[PDB]
Design a protein around this motif. Structure first.
Motif, PDB file in Angstrom:
ATOM      1  N   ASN A  37      38.424  20.942  19.549  1.00  0.00           N
ATOM      2  CA  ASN A  37      39.563  21.170  20.427  1.00  0.00           C
ATOM      3  C   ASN A  37      39.222  22.223  21.473  1.00  0.00           C
ATOM      4  N   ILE A  38      39.637  21.962  22.714  1.00  0.00           N
ATOM      5  CA  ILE A  38      39.194  22.746  23.861  1.00  0.00           C
ATOM      6  C   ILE A  38      40.218  23.783  24.319  1.00  0.00           C
ATOM      7  N   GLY A  39      41.473  23.689  23.867  1.00  0.00           N
ATOM      8  CA  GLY A  39      42.532  24.507  24.446  1.00  0.00           C
ATOM      9  C   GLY A  39      42.295  26.000  24.302  1.00  0.00           C
ATOM     10  N   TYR A  40      41.799  26.424  23.138  1.00  0.00           N
ATOM     11  CA  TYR A  40      41.549  27.844  22.912  1.00  0.00           C
ATOM     12  C   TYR A  40      40.539  28.389  23.910  1.00  0.00           C
ATOM     13  N   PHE A  41      39.468  27.639  24.164  1.00  0.00           N
ATOM     14  CA  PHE A  41      38.409  28.139  25.029  1.00  0.00           C
ATOM     15  C   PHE A  41      38.864  28.217  26.479  1.00  0.00           C
ATOM     16  N   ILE A  42      39.570  27.194  26.966  1.00  0.00           N
ATOM     17  CA  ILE A  42      40.047  27.254  28.344  1.00  0.00           C
ATOM     18  C   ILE A  42      41.089  28.353  28.498  1.00  0.00           C
ATOM     19  N   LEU A  43      41.911  28.586  27.473  1.00  0.00           N
ATOM     20  CA  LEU A  43      42.896  29.657  27.570  1.00  0.00           C
ATOM     21  C   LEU A  43      42.230  31.027  27.580  1.00  0.00           C
ATOM     22  N   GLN A  44      41.209  31.223  26.745  1.00  0.00           N
ATOM     23  CA  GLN A  44      40.652  32.548  26.501  1.00  0.00           C
ATOM     24  C   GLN A  44      39.408  32.863  27.319  1.00  0.00           C
ATOM     25  N   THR A  45      38.627  31.854  27.710  1.00  0.00           N
ATOM     26  CA  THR A  45      37.259  32.067  28.174  1.00  0.00           C
ATOM     27  C   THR A  45      37.028  31.665  29.622  1.00  0.00           C
ATOM     28  N   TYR A  46      37.406  30.450  30.022  1.00  0.00           N
ATOM     29  CA  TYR A  46      36.934  29.917  31.303  1.00  0.00           C
ATOM     30  C   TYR A  46      37.752  30.432  32.485  1.00  0.00           C
ATOM     31  N   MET A  47      39.009  30.026  32.563  1.00  0.00           N
ATOM     32  CA  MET A  47      39.772  30.341  33.761  1.00  0.00           C
ATOM     33  C   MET A  47      40.130  31.831  33.855  1.00  0.00           C
ATOM     34  N   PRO A  48      40.143  32.641  32.776  1.00  0.00           N
ATOM     35  CA  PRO A  48      40.126  34.098  33.025  1.00  0.00           C
ATOM     36  C   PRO A  48      38.931  34.536  33.857  1.00  0.00           C
ATOM     37  N   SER A  49      37.757  33.958  33.593  1.00  0.00           N
ATOM     38  CA  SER A  49      36.592  34.249  34.419  1.00  0.00           C
ATOM     39  C   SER A  49      36.799  33.741  35.839  1.00  0.00           C
ATOM     40  N   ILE A  50      37.473  32.598  35.989  1.00  0.00           N
ATOM     41  CA  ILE A  50      37.791  32.113  37.334  1.00  0.00           C
ATOM     42  C   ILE A  50      38.680  33.116  38.063  1.00  0.00           C
ATOM     43  N   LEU A  51      39.668  33.671  37.361  1.00  0.00           N
ATOM     44  CA  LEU A  51      40.558  34.654  37.970  1.00  0.00           C
ATOM     45  C   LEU A  51      39.795  35.904  38.385  1.00  0.00           C
ATOM     46  N   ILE A  52      38.871  36.365  37.542  1.00  0.00           N
ATOM     47  CA  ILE A  52      38.083  37.540  37.905  1.00  0.00           C
ATOM     48  C   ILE A  52      37.206  37.235  39.114  1.00  0.00           C
ATOM     49  N   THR A  53      36.684  36.011  39.199  1.00  0.00           N
ATOM     50  CA  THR A  53      35.899  35.632  40.369  1.00  0.00           C
ATOM     51  C   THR A  53      36.756  35.638  41.631  1.00  0.00           C
ATOM     52  N   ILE A  54      38.002  35.177  41.525  1.00  0.00           N
ATOM     53  CA  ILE A  54      38.903  35.225  42.675  1.00  0.00           C
ATOM     54  C   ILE A  54      39.168  36.674  43.077  1.00  0.00           C
ATOM     55  N   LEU A  55      39.355  37.551  42.088  1.00  0.00           N
ATOM     56  CA  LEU A  55      39.520  38.970  42.386  1.00  0.00           C
ATOM     57  C   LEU A  55      38.289  39.535  43.077  1.00  0.00           C
ATOM     58  N   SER A  56      37.105  39.033  42.735  1.00  0.00           N
ATOM     59  CA  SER A  56      35.912  39.427  43.475  1.00  0.00           C
ATOM     60  C   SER A  56      35.984  38.939  44.916  1.00  0.00           C
ATOM     61  N   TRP A  57      36.464  37.709  45.124  1.00  0.00           N
ATOM     62  CA  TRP A  57      36.569  37.172  46.481  1.00  0.00           C
ATOM     63  C   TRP A  57      37.554  37.958  47.331  1.00  0.00           C
ATOM     64  N   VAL A  58      38.532  38.608  46.702  1.00  0.00           N
ATOM     65  CA  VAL A  58      39.552  39.375  47.422  1.00  0.00           C
ATOM     66  C   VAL A  58      38.924  40.432  48.332  1.00  0.00           C
ATOM     67  N   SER A  59      37.711  40.887  48.001  1.00  0.00           N
ATOM     68  CA  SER A  59      37.055  41.925  48.791  1.00  0.00           C
ATOM     69  C   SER A  59      36.835  41.502  50.239  1.00  0.00           C
ATOM     70  N   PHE A  60      36.684  40.201  50.499  1.00  0.00           N
ATOM     71  CA  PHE A  60      36.346  39.755  51.847  1.00  0.00           C
ATOM     72  C   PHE A  60      37.478  39.975  52.841  1.00  0.00           C
ATOM     73  N   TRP A  61      38.729  40.001  52.384  1.00  0.00           N
ATOM     74  CA  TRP A  61      39.857  40.234  53.277  1.00  0.00           C
ATOM     75  C   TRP A  61      40.118  41.711  53.537  1.00  0.00           C
ATOM     76  N   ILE A  62      39.526  42.607  52.745  1.00  0.00           N
ATOM     77  CA  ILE A  62      39.686  44.035  52.988  1.00  0.00           C
ATOM     78  C   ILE A  62      38.874  44.439  54.218  1.00  0.00           C
ATOM     79  N   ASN A  63      39.370  45.454  54.922  1.00  0.00           N
ATOM     80  CA  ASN A  63      38.717  45.933  56.133  1.00  0.00           C
ATOM     81  C   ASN A  63      37.292  46.392  55.844  1.00  0.00           C
ATOM     82  N   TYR A  64      36.384  46.075  56.771  1.00  0.00           N
ATOM     83  CA  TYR A  64      34.974  46.402  56.576  1.00  0.00           C
ATOM     84  C   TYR A  64      34.742  47.908  56.580  1.00  0.00           C
ATOM     85  N   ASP A  65      35.559  48.656  57.327  1.00  0.00           N
ATOM     86  CA  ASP A  65      35.361  50.101  57.410  1.00  0.00           C
ATOM     87  C   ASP A  65      35.580  50.771  56.058  1.00  0.00           C
TER      88      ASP A  65
END
Ligand SMILES: *[C@@H]1O[C@H](CO)[C@@H](O[C@@H]2O[C@H](CO)[C@@H](O[C@@H]3O[C@H](CO[C@H]4O[C@H](CO[C@H]5O[C@H](CO)[C@@H](O)[C@H](O)[C@@H]5O)[C@@H](O)[C@H](O[C@H]5O[C@H](CO)[C@@H](O)[C@H](O)[C@@H]5O[C@H]5O[C@H](CO)[C@@H](O)[C@H](O)[C@@H]5O)[C@@H]4O)[C@@H](O)[C@H](O[C@H]4O[C@H](CO)[C@@H](O)[C@H](O)[C@@H]4O)[C@@H]3O)[C@H](O)[C@H]2NC(C)=O)[C@H](O)[C@H]1NC(C)=O
Ligand SMILES: *[C@@H]1O[C@H](CO)[C@@H](O[C@@H]2O[C@H](CO)[C@@H](O[C@@H]3O[C@H](CO[C@H]4O[C@H](CO[C@H]5O[C@H](CO)[C@@H](O)[C@H](O)[C@@H]5O)[C@@H](O)[C@H](O[C@H]5O[C@H](CO)[C@@H](O)[C@H](O)[C@@H]5O)[C@@H]4O)[C@@H](O)[C@H](O[C@H]4O[C@H](CO)[C@@H](O)[C@H](O)[C@@H]4O)[C@@H]3O)[C@H](O)[C@H]2NC(C)=O)[C@H](O)[C@H]1NC(C)=O
Ligand code: PGW
Ligand SMILES: *[C@@H]1O[C@H](CO)[C@@H](O[C@@H]2O[C@H](CO)[C@@H](O[C@@H]3O[C@H](CO)[C@@H](O)[C@H](O)[C@@H]3O)[C@H](O)[C@H]2NC(C)=O)[C@H](O)[C@H]1NC(C)=O
Ligand code: PX2
Ligand code: CLR
Ligand code: R16
Ligand code: R16
Ligand code: R16
Ligand code: NAG
Ligand code: D10
Ligand code: D10
Ligand code: D10
Ligand code: HEX
Ligand code: HEX
Lengths: 330, 217, 62, 117, 125, 264, 117, 115
Positions: free
Chosen positions: F209-237
């Motif tokens: 069964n896959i539900g536990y792993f997708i809940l706990q492991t995969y898309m939390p990492s996707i969310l952290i990756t999106i939080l990493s992408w957030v840096s690009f919209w911050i001002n370069y200075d």
């Protein structure tokens, strides 16, 4: 002393250990009762529980009837090997044994009307299937199933001696995490291809205590979400403070989740605690995304309207989610 | 800070009191060299013998029990939990002395202090059998967490309010009681209050806590 | 029986009594903390603050 | 304490839904009684809904599926015969109860839906 | 981890009220081998403590840098001390390594407190 | 009462325990029957699964035939030492036992024609190699192999009594992560140097069964990756904010991956 | 199920590729059928590929190898002789099947490839 | 596969090269002309334990070092009966007693010492 010894010899002389009491005739009725010494372990990872008990069985054998001796002969335990006993066994057991210190913990007592009492101190690891979909807000049904192995209802019959008072000592059990709410005694005749087999069932309804999770799980998560709400109330141009606060709240949430589920039992499917922790994670993530929107829209390219909406929306949304969670699972 | 009395009981399995009667010899229990015992995380205080007649379903049975008294040693947890938690709560008060204009510094200090408290709280419940009720050390850690959370919220409130904003021998029952007159845009002094208000309170709690478990527990 | 455990109190009335005594103790300790607040705040306000705090503690205790 | 409600009744699809302590009674099965005949086994299915077992007389023309988000078992029919006319009942059985093919081991029964073809 | 330094044999008659009972004893003296501790538990703590001293050379007006350095080295020390608890034997007892880790924790805490002092005195009021 | 006793005593007399039925004759045809109760504790680290079952062996010994007693006997434990039984064993076992409480869970039942039924209640730990190269999206196929120890197929012949209906109680298993998709029965003759030995095999297909792993492991990492992408919209200075966000996202990813390792 | 394909029919290195549930049938081995002589065991290799077993008549001259790039199982024919001419098959065996040298224990077989030199 | 090369005219040295881990215990034997090999001493992998014969007690000592030359024999109070060739030897982990030479494999090249 000589009279008692000769009487015992006469009872054991010419005795067959291979025919039930009243072999050709109505089935022998075995009355059984249990005294639960303790319930030690209740493992969800293995889905079982350990139980120590003073199992006791009573039947009536006319072959072991004696007269002239006005007392109940409590014989040495080894005589159990020289007498017929039921073939009772626990159906949902994974591993069990009889204690053997200082000697074999066994009891044989022959009353003068043929009534034989047979006692055993038994520890059993009984299987208890569990439904941890509402964990830790769950209420399990653990059971112990007792059944004759070879004989059937036409030969052996089971009944709880003393009705509902057969099982004693349940009230004195102090489980660390669970609380025993009820115990039920049930008697049935399970129908098989060979025939109908007697069965007895002792069913406990454990209820988990939410005092450890409320102190370790929910409170840190709520406070960290409140700290993200504190991050909302900071100036927009102060980017270092807001970014550090949001990302460190996310890191704290991940730390809480990891250490918690490492400490807690590992059950690989969805649980209520996972949904709550993940809702909190999503909220703290949304806070940092909201700051990203604020920084890009205004500072990137004094009212700060997005902050004004967020200050009211996020607490209200979290309160609504909390109420939905505490209504659905309770 | 708990004491326990572990029992060890024995009796005849099948023979009731009217068939077998156990009896203690004079000074029957013989402890060897108490220094030659493997009792770590616990100190032996003494023992005692008893005897009783238990009423079971089979009959009345003579039960003979020996109790051993054991006192836990609070040496490991003083250096593992109590001292680091207190030092972290003390570090939380450093923010009140930093200049208010250092927003990233104070924010990082507060939030990383909360993170460190969270990390410390994990190792609290290691030895215990995950009891639902709250023990002493769990309460201490929880109160420390509340102090650090309170300090961070205090700085948040200060920053928001300082930066983002520009008849009978007495007198009127409402005004003689309530001092609403001359009351307030004095939020800017909050740090000066907290520097005394946050430490002192902790000490009071701390004092009460130890008393409530040491002399009278 | 201990206040830490809530499965050992004989009745909810004792639970409420213990809770109210908790609030009383917290309030009086809060004013004892407020003793240390005299150096900054004027006396006319701090005495009033403990007056209200002690009254609330009294109401909780009764 | 589980209560069963049966719905439905060439191509048919009965849906027996359950409410209550379903986890205590996971092994859920279908029987049928023709008029004037004794009750007979038709099918069974487990909690996970992947352990179907059918009687030989109704094999290769029946199907059983289960869903737990809405606690229900669906009995999907196929090419029928005139003997298939009967009152179809839905029952539940607890873990550690006994064999599947006997109705006495089943505790909670349904009202029964009449089907005629 | 161990190294047998020396082994001994003893034979004696233990005296008891029932009578003298024969007895023999085979003893070994095991010395624990450092290297999995001095390179591995002591060294990171000392390095983190030395890192905490970096704040004294950074300029006094760098509030964010010095505060982040101090609080993060405190966090790292707590992380090491918490996760070595499951690494070392699970025997609650005041060991020497506990004293060393406590000393390092006190040192980094004092460094952060020193920054608090200098920031209040020379930069603020 | 005594009649059956003397009958069984006569039956035991003149019986050779060391010799199978029909030593020179055709092989004894022994049927196996299994009633499963649990496949609990399907361990991935140990590559084994614990299985509890009720195991009947069914054969026909003419040496034990009796007449005049229409009742089928249930003569059990003295016979467990005084009769020949098949030497069946589980090949891929690692540790197994017969449940002993309250009595030894064993049953010998005789019949007038000579038919013998031999039931045991056995818990075993059978090895099951797993291909975790697609974990947690994997699908395993565990097996239990049953074989005669010493005797060759010319002496003993195994078969599944009742055909595909031999194994029952498959529906009773409820594992936390896996779900039994199919069970199969197989009968073969394995050719060793000594000769062709019989073999039976009971195979299960397990889907994770896959539900536990997708809940706990995969898309939390996707969310952290999106939080990493957030840096690009911050001002370069701004330097402290972007560097702190990136490095703390790296730290959070390392923490997540490492703790997932720590319980897997 | 697994499908086995053979190719590469001096030194003539054969190639044997598998498609399907090759994990369930870890060991694979080479056999040969000469005209008028039944199938015989040439060699065998395991799942990891670090262990191999050859027959006496062909030892020290052939080196079976495993790569798993395309589930390939090379043979590395070397030191060829006219007597070593036969239709070579590559087959797969289950985890619990018994001996290596007996073709009866092997389940899935290739079509065979002829080598003459 | 272990090769032992020993030197000595006094501190005798022995260097073991190869899979030395599989042959942890190593020792010294002696033999004079017309005589059979006799056990002198032995040293184990850890180096914290030793073994010496009674005839060479309190006089000859053995020590272990890291790297390659992990066997050193210190000789004191030489006697004319000590005139002999001394052999370095190595033994496997699971083997018999140290005193018996036949249990040893991969013998070294005997160094001659004449008092
Ligand atoms: C989990 O993984 C495991 C593997 O790790 C899986 O195991 C495999 O599962 C398969 C099913 O999915 C099994 O397939 C079946 O195997 C049977 C084995 O039978 C052996 O003996 C047969 C004869 O036995 C009878 O003999 C006579 C009959 O009159 C009497 O004495 C008795 O009644 C006996 O019982 C025999 O036919 C089989 O084969 C071989 O015989 C000789 C041996 O030298 C040769 O002729 C062949 O080698 C022959 O096999 C092959 O050649 C034929 C040629 O036509 C090919 O078609 C075959 O594919 C093969 O290459 C056995 O030795 C089979 O009887 C059974 O046959 C039926 O199904 C096939 C396939 O549809 C049909 O072709 C047949 O006609 C018949 O209907 C079937 O093949 C595997 O044995 C089994 N493997 C192992 C190692 O156990 C498991 O399924 C997985 N499961 C899960 C849940 O994931
Ligand atoms: C924890 O969870 C578990 C989950 O399994 C749960 O278990 C169930 O618990 C309930 C009780 O709460 C059990 O229900 C009862 O079953 C009793 C026994 O029923 C059998 O026997 C009936 C005949 O009585 C005779 O039984 C034997 C025979 O040898 C013997 O004791 C006597 O001779 C006695 O006379 C029999 O009729 C019944 O048959 C069932 O099915 C037939 C049709 O096939 C139907 O006609 C029956 O109605 C019945 O459903 C069965 O074989 C039963 O006596 C008892 O009855 C009470 O109810 C009746 C009204 O029905 C009242 O009149 C009476 O006064 C009693 O109050 C009750 O029905 C249930 O069996 C358990 N489940 C399983 C699988 O065993 C635990 O309870 C949970 N516990 C906690 C604490 O949470
Ligand atoms: C800066 C601010 C600082 C101040 C504020 C700090 C934060 C707050 C801290 C502490 C208060 C916590 C609130 C506690 C409220 C819930 C307490 C509760 O559950 O009551 C139970 C009553 O028994 C019963 O009827 C049993 C049924 C109880 C059902 C309770 C429903 C859950 C409600 C979820 C609460 C959500 C809020 C949590 C936020 C922390 C006690 O039995 P418990 O359960 O323990 O075990 C079973 C027992 O048998 C163990 O021995
Ligand atoms: C003593 O043991 C024998 C052998 O098991 C018992 O005979 C068995 O008798 C029953 C009842 O007739 C048979 O059941 C029948 O099965 C057939 C085929 O499935 C079915 O068509 C019938 O309707 C009936 O259900 C059973 O087959 C038979 N055993 C065998 C091996 O054939 C006998 O009953 C036992 N003694 C007593 C007193 O029960
Ligand atoms: C083990 C550590 C021992 C350290 C003790 C060192 C002696 C410090 C005594 C404090 C008195 C003092 O030194 O006065 C210096 C300044 C003067 O302020 P100003 O008016 O010149 O701006 O005002 C100050 O008092 C300095 C600021 C002190 C605040 C320290 C905050 C950290 C303590 C937190 C826990 C309570
Ligand atoms: C900080 C100020 C304002 C308030 C502090 C209140 C403190 C002193 C209160 C809050 C919670 C209280 C504890 C709650 C429960 C118990 C269990 C009881 O069996 C002994 C007292 C004890 C251990 C209390 C001691 C006092 C306590 C620690
Ligand atoms: C038997 C030893 C028990 C442990 C006693 C406490 C260890 C010493 C703690 C020192 C605390 C220093 C705090 C830093 C400020 C002085
Ligand atoms: C076992 C002897 C009595 C208890 C000793 C406790 C020592 C450690 C207490 C932790 C420090 C509390 C006071 C902190 C003051 C700011
Ligand atoms: C103006 C009120 C004080 C704001 C200081 C920041 C505290 C933020 C904590 C979260 C409190 C949310 C309460 C709901 C406000 C609409
Ligand atoms: C401390 C202690 O030994 N207490 C009693 C002792 O006084 C008594 O003589 C003995 C016999 O019952 O039992 C014990
Ligand atoms: C005189 C300036 C400093 C006063 C600080 C308040 C007292 C110390 C509280 C810890
Ligand atoms: C190791 C602590 C920081 C070292 C600073 C280097 C200063 C150089 C002085 C010349
Ligand atoms: C990927 C998270 C940041 C996305 C910011 C999008 C802003 C676009 C203007 C509304
Ligand atoms: C877990 C769902 C959270 C949604 C918050 C908007
Ligand atoms: C979540 C708040 C969004 C406000 C947009 C104006």
């Amino acid at each position: 002393m000589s009279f008692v010894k000769e009487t015992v010899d006469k009872l054991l002389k010419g005795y067959d250990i291979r025919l039930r009491p009243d072999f050709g005739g109505p089935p022998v009725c075995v009355g059984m009762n249990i005294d639960i010494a303790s319930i030690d372990m209740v493992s969800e990872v293995n889905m079982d529980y350990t139980l120590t008990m003073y199992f006791q069985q009573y039947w009536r054998d006319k072959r072991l009837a004696y007269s002239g001796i006005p007392l109940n002969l409590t014989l040495d335990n080894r005589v159990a090997d020289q007498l017929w006993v039921p073939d009772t066994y626990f159906l949902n057991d994974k591993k069990s044994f009889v204690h053997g210190v200082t000697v074999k913990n066994r009891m044989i007592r022959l009353h003068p009307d043929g009534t034989v009492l047979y006692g055993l101190r038994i520890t059993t690891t009984a299987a208890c299937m569990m439904d941890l979909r509402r964990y830790p807000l769950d209420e399990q049904n653990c059971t112990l199933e007792i059944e004759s192995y070879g004989y059937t209802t036409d030969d052996i019959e089971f009944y709880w001696r003393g009705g509902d008072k057969a099982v004693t000592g349940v009230e004195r059990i102090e489980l660390p995490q669970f609380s025993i709410v009820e115990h039920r005694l049930v008697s049935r005749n399970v129908v098989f291809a060979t025939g109908a087999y007697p069965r007895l069932s002792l069913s406990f309804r454990l209820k988990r205590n939410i005092g450890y999770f409320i102190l370790q799980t929910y409170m840190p998560s709520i406070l960290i979400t409140i700290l993200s709400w504190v991050s909302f109330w900071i100036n927009y141009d102060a980017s270092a403070a807001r970014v550090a606060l949001g990302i460190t709240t996310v890191l704290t949430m991940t730390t809480i989740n990891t250490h918690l589920r490492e400490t807690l039992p590992k059950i690989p499917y969805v649980k209520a605690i996972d949904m709550y922790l993940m809702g909190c994670f999503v909220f703290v993530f949304l806070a940092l995304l909201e700051y990203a929107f604020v920084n890009y829209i205004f500072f990137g390219r004094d009212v700060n309207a997005i902050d004004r909406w967020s200050r009211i929306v996020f607490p209200f949304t979290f309160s609504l989610f909390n109420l939905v969670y505490w209504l659905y699972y309770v | 800070m708990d004491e326990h009395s572990c029992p060890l009981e024995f009796s005849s399995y099948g023979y009731p009191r009217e068939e077998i009667v156990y009896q203690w010899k004079r000074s029957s229990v013989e402890v060897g060299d108490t220094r030659s015992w493997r009792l770590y995380q616990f100190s032996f205080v003494g023992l005692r013998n008893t005897t009783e007649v238990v009423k079971t379903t089979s009959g009345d049975y003579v039960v003979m029990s020996v109790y051993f008294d054991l006192s836990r040693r609070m040496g490991y947890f003083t250096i593992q939990t109590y001292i680091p938690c207190t030092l972290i709560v003390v570090l939380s008060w450093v923010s009140f002395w930093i200049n208010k204009d250092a927003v990233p510094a104070r924010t990082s200090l507060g939030i990383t202090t909360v993170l460190t408290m969270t990390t410390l709280s994990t190792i609290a419940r290691k030895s215990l059998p995950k009891v639902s009720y709250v023990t002493a050390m769990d309460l201490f850690v929880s109160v420390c967490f509340i102090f650090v959370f309170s300090a961070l919220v205090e700085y948040g409130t200060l920053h928001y309010f300082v930066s983002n904003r520009k008849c009978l021998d007495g007198k009127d029952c409402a005004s003689f009681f309530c001092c609403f007159e001359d009351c307030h845009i004095r939020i800017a002094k909050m740090d000066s209050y907290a520097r005394i208000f946050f430490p002192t309170a902790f000490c009071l709690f701390n004092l009460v806590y130890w008393v409530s478990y040491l002399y009278l527990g | 029986g201990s206040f830490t455990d809530f499965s050992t109190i004989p009745s909810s009335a004792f639970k409420a009594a213990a809770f109210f005594v908790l609030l009383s103790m917290v309030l009086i300790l809060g004013c004892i903390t407020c003793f240390s607040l005299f150096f900054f705040c004027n006396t006319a306000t701090v005495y009033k603050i403990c007056a209200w705090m002690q009254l609330l503690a009294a109401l909780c205790l009764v | 304490q589980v209560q069963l409600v049966e719905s439905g009744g060439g191509s048919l699809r009965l849906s027996c839904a359950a409410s209550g302590h379903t986890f205590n009674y996971p092994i859920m099965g279908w029987f049928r009684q023709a008029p004037g005949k004794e009750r007979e086994f038709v099918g069974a299915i487990s909690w996970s809904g992947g352990s179907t077992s059918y009687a030989d007389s109704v094999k290769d023309r029946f199907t059983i599926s289960r869903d737990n988000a809405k606690n229900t078992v669906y009995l999907e029919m196929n090419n029928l015969k005139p003997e298939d006319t009967a009152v179809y009942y839905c029952a539940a059985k607890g873990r550690y109860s006994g064999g599947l093919y006997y109705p006495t081991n089943y505790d909670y029964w349904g009202q029964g839906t009449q089907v005629t073809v």
